[PDB]
Amino acid sequence: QDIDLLQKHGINVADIKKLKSVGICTIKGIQMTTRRALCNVKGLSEAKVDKIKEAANKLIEPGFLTAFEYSEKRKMVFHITTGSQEFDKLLGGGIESMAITEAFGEFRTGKTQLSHTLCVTAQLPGAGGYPGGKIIFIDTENTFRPDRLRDIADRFNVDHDAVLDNVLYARAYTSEHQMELLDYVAAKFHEEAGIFKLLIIDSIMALFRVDFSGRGELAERQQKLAQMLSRLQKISEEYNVAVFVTNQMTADPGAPKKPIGGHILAHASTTRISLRKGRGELRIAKIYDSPEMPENEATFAITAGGIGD
Amino acid sequence: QDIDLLQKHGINVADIKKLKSVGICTIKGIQMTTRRALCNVKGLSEAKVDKIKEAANKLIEPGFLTAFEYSEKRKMVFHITTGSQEFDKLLGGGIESMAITEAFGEFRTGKTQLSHTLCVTAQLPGAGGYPGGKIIFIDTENTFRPDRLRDIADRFNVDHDAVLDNVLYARAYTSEHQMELLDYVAAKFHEEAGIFKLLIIDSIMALFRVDFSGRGELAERQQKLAQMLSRLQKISEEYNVAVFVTNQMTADPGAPKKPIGGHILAHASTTRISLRKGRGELRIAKIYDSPEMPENEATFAITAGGIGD
Amino acid sequence: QDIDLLQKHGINVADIKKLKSVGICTIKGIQMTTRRALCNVKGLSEAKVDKIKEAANKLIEPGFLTAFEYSEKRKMVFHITTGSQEFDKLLGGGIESMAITEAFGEFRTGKTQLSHTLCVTAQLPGAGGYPGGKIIFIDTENTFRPDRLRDIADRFNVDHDAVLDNVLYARAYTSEHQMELLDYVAAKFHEEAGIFKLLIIDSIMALFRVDFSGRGELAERQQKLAQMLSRLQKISEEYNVAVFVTNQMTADPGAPKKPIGGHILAHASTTRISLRKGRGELRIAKIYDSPEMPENEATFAITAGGIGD
DNA sequence: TTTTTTTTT
DNA sequence: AAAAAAAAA
Ligand SMILES: Nc1ncnc2c1ncn2[C@@H]1O[C@H](COP(=O)(O)OP(=O)(O)NP(=O)(O)O)[C@@H](O)[C@H]1O
Ligand SMILES: Nc1ncnc2c1ncn2[C@@H]1O[C@H](COP(=O)(O)OP(=O)(O)NP(=O)(O)O)[C@@H](O)[C@H]1O
Ligand SMILES: Nc1ncnc2c1ncn2[C@@H]1O[C@H](COP(=O)(O)OP(=O)(O)NP(=O)(O)O)[C@@H](O)[C@H]1O
Ligand SMILES: [Ca+2]
Ligand SMILES: [Ca+2]
Ligand SMILES: [Ca+2]
């Protein structure tokens, strides 16, 4: 899986450790970089980069899979449950495995309570043979109270010390620190192959809407957000992990609410779960922009223990 | 149809297998390449390429067809239906057969639901004697859930295993991998003559808007998109297949929405179908830039089963 | 903690006093500024700012803390009590230490009486080993009667002259004077390290709702309020101090009351305490938007001596 | 050719 | 039941 199949196929050793300096560590990682962004890396020409692409092209089929073959090749995908069976039948078993899942709400709709539940119920063996693994959590506002994890872990009856161990944690401080933090994500997914299951970014747009002005720096903002969302799509298919992201809302005095991000974020997201408030601690959850499931509604219970019924 | 009529017309055998190395496999394929791009191929001079163009020019008429002759010669064209009779009377029978058809929407307007329907209703014998054939699908975002094909195939009452067999599938990963994937398309159209009917690119501009910067690399981007769209126009007339492409949108703070691509994509496209959202699961479809049909509107129903009424 | 670790790591002396001119005085302060807002400062290029970010990156771990490590690293946080044990069991021990706490009421609900109590009960050694320290108070309406502090200090039996000494005071006059007053806050937190515990802004939105018009200058107002609230989040984690803010209310003729600020203020606030009036001098306090504590209610007594039972 | 922001009473 | 303004690559 890692880059040593090219040594027996016409590539010497003096560039394998030079390609590993930028972040490329997988054979499919060479399939995902352009030939123009392999020259501006630190010390390679145009004459010797052509013989790397023909070296990698013999290892994977450059052909056309039949749709019957892709049906079995779409059995890598797991479905990570939420904590309530009314929210998983809505989503269709849980969260997808090679995709980006969005969720947005007003202000008290339970976004990080949905995030804090997933830090517990992804370490548990669910349906379909999903084994469970460790969890990357990139917090961005402040909200990673870890004693709330010890409050949800008791209703699933798991040990306290062995549920606070599989959650790796790192806080971003600005918009570019959120982008340079994805390099250590791709390394930790790669050096320990097969024991990571999801990646949670607590809010993508909580730092872009503050580090940029209004109409002046709008075009640089969406051209920097698109470079980040495409990198997350490649990470979620390199190592087959789920991605769950949340974002906030804004008003509309031109005509009520709508999520921020624009058309860049709405297109690059696979599923979007709207969230609003009901009576007491019930919450209503709709479905926006799903490839498979239709638009229905469900109900929550944000109790001590995350999401319930 | 293939290149062996030149052997009896002054061309030896030592270049026929040398022209087949680049991709030229048809007599009309020599009519579509320049005399300047036949020298930079791998091993031919200027003195021996002149005697190939005079060898091919005696086989097809270098004259002027009367418009009465071209009327019968425009009876190769079929029309592939959508799934609703309100959307085919708008388009004028369905999708054109020697052309490029575009469709763009906001984010939930049902673009890949329109694409997933065409993977089923092109294997069915429709009106005008259209027999039905296999389907090339080039996905670019992630969205080729094949179990949705088993959900539309039941409302047309066809067998499940014989509808998952005629869909060949390949995913592009970068912008140049999307261009080098068209070589295997032209070979698979050629080696099995007459059993392919359409080609679907899921999004052209979902990879160009991310692999290029703003005003810096704008001119290289549109000069690489124009090389791809012209290649698709030649493929759609070599083997007489339909081309259906989709693309996304952007805002306009200078003055609402407009499709990306610029003037290169709007000129090289034959028909453009705008798509917006109505109440519930109704959608409204307009017509932009059609050579034949006027500007009208229709209505959809994106149910389990693709497009309905 | 201050910026002298870079002198032994490839940074000369000619920019350390030039970075101190804008406000950057801590090693983590370089972790919180962008690379784009380090060029427009007064005299630095793009070629010499790259070697500052690599100089600071070796000092702190650019890695991933385990959640067991972050549990001990969340023991910096203290909890500043209010004055009644019914309001601290509701909040969960008191006010948070790395967060922004909001409180809103109708007009007589006791917002500045809640603020005037905190100027006294933060100089007292409470539970959990909280030592007590000095207090920054940014008043914005007019309401900092200091003889009310001598009325609450007697029920805690502390000396009068040594409770009027630890309260530094400054009044803002317009919206931008409220923003330029935070520069002297960050300097006074830095030059006397470890003897400041909270920062009180008396009202954020008492000056934004008057210096701006209706729908005309709405977008500039929320784009200037978001620049201020993010700066307060960084201050509250640079030096580990609490932030307590209050704001007012408005009606709703479209359909009763709701707090001003919009979705910018509701998202950037960590905890919100609603306040209403009961019979006599009892007041009722609810909880809006808390990461840890559920929605319950309590009771007050605004007597001579601040908040009681 | 590119790119959406923001509730008041 | 009514009210709009914002630009740089
Ligand atoms: N232990 C708990 N038991 C019950 N409800 C709780 C508990 N902790 C928090 N809540 C509720 O959960 C809600 C807060 O959810 P939260 O995860 O903060 O959503 P949020 O949208 O991220 N808030 P914000 O990030 O500011 O927009 C509030 O209604 C709290 O009252
Ligand atoms: N089985 C189904 N029944 C009914 N509606 C469905 C079904 N599956 C998906 N939908 C709806 O179809 C819409 C999604 O259409 P889609 O094909 O994703 O358009 P799209 O523009 O390609 N989305 P995107 O590519 O991100 O822009 C959503 O409104 C879904 O709720
Ligand atoms: N010495 C005192 N003893 C008891 N109650 C007092 C005393 N001084 C003031 N109050 C009460 O405190 C209340 C005013 O508290 P205050 O914190 O000023 O509310 P407020 O919300 O700030 N008013 P405003 O700023 O205009 O919204 C009134 O009900 C007064 O009667
Ligand atoms: Ca939150
Ligand atoms: Ca799609
Ligand atoms: Ca007051």
mmCIF file with all atom_site columns, N, CA, C and O and ligand atoms in Angstrom, chain A residues 111-112 141 143 202-203, chain C residues 289, ligand 4:
data_model
loop_
_atom_site.group_PDB
_atom_site.id
_atom_site.type_symbol
_atom_site.label_atom_id
_atom_site.label_alt_id
_atom_site.label_comp_id
_atom_site.label_asym_id
_atom_site.label_entity_id
_atom_site.label_seq_id
_atom_site.pdbx_PDB_ins_code
_atom_site.Cartn_x
_atom_site.Cartn_y
_atom_site.Cartn_z
_atom_site.occupancy
_atom_site.B_iso_or_equiv
_atom_site.pdbx_formal_charge
_atom_site.auth_seq_id
_atom_site.auth_comp_id
_atom_site.auth_asym_id
_atom_site.auth_atom_id
_atom_site.pdbx_PDB_model_num
ATOM   1  N  N  . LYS A 1 111 ? -25.407 20.581 18.203 1.00 0.00 ? 111 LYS A N  1
ATOM   2  C  CA . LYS A 1 111 ? -24.419 20.164 17.219 1.00 0.00 ? 111 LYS A CA 1
ATOM   3  C  C  . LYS A 1 111 ? -23.246 19.459 17.881 1.00 0.00 ? 111 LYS A C  1
ATOM   4  O  O  . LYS A 1 111 ? -22.845 18.375 17.452 1.00 0.00 ? 111 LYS A O  1
ATOM   5  N  N  . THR A 1 112 ? -22.680 20.052 18.930 1.00 0.00 ? 112 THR A N  1
ATOM   6  C  CA . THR A 1 112 ? -21.575 19.391 19.606 1.00 0.00 ? 112 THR A CA 1
ATOM   7  C  C  . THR A 1 112 ? -22.049 18.276 20.519 1.00 0.00 ? 112 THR A C  1
ATOM   8  O  O  . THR A 1 112 ? -21.248 17.411 20.877 1.00 0.00 ? 112 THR A O  1
ATOM   9  N  N  . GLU A 1 141 ? -14.006 25.852 18.140 1.00 0.00 ? 141 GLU A N  1
ATOM   10 C  CA . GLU A 1 141 ? -14.476 26.970 18.947 1.00 0.00 ? 141 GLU A CA 1
ATOM   11 C  C  . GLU A 1 141 ? -13.868 26.986 20.338 1.00 0.00 ? 141 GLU A C  1
ATOM   12 O  O  . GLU A 1 141 ? -12.929 27.744 20.593 1.00 0.00 ? 141 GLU A O  1
ATOM   13 N  N  . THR A 1 143 ? -15.196 23.871 22.297 1.00 0.00 ? 143 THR A N  1
ATOM   14 C  CA . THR A 1 143 ? -16.148 22.983 22.965 1.00 0.00 ? 143 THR A CA 1
ATOM   15 C  C  . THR A 1 143 ? -15.742 21.524 22.791 1.00 0.00 ? 143 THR A C  1
ATOM   16 O  O  . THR A 1 143 ? -16.234 20.795 21.929 1.00 0.00 ? 143 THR A O  1
ATOM   17 N  N  . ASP A 1 202 ? -14.985 20.413 14.088 1.00 0.00 ? 202 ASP A N  1
ATOM   18 C  CA . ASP A 1 202 ? -16.101 20.922 14.877 1.00 0.00 ? 202 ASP A CA 1
ATOM   19 C  C  . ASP A 1 202 ? -16.829 22.049 14.170 1.00 0.00 ? 202 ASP A C  1
ATOM   20 O  O  . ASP A 1 202 ? -18.059 22.115 14.233 1.00 0.00 ? 202 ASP A O  1
ATOM   21 N  N  . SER A 1 203 ? -16.105 22.944 13.504 1.00 0.00 ? 203 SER A N  1
ATOM   22 C  CA . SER A 1 203 ? -16.734 23.898 12.600 1.00 0.00 ? 203 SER A CA 1
ATOM   23 C  C  . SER A 1 203 ? -15.713 24.309 11.558 1.00 0.00 ? 203 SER A C  1
ATOM   24 O  O  . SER A 1 203 ? -14.596 24.699 11.900 1.00 0.00 ? 203 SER A O  1
ATOM   25 N  N  . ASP C 1 289 ? -28.201 27.524 25.949 1.00 0.00 ? 289 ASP C N  1
ATOM   26 C  CA . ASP C 1 289 ? -27.014 27.205 25.148 1.00 0.00 ? 289 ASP C CA 1
ATOM   27 C  C  . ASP C 1 289 ? -25.791 26.986 26.046 1.00 0.00 ? 289 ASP C C  1
ATOM   28 O  O  . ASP C 1 289 ? -24.930 27.841 26.215 1.00 0.00 ? 289 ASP C O  1
HETATM 29 CA CA . CA  F 2 .   ? -20.802 24.286 19.777 1.00 0.00 ? 4   CA  F CA 1
#
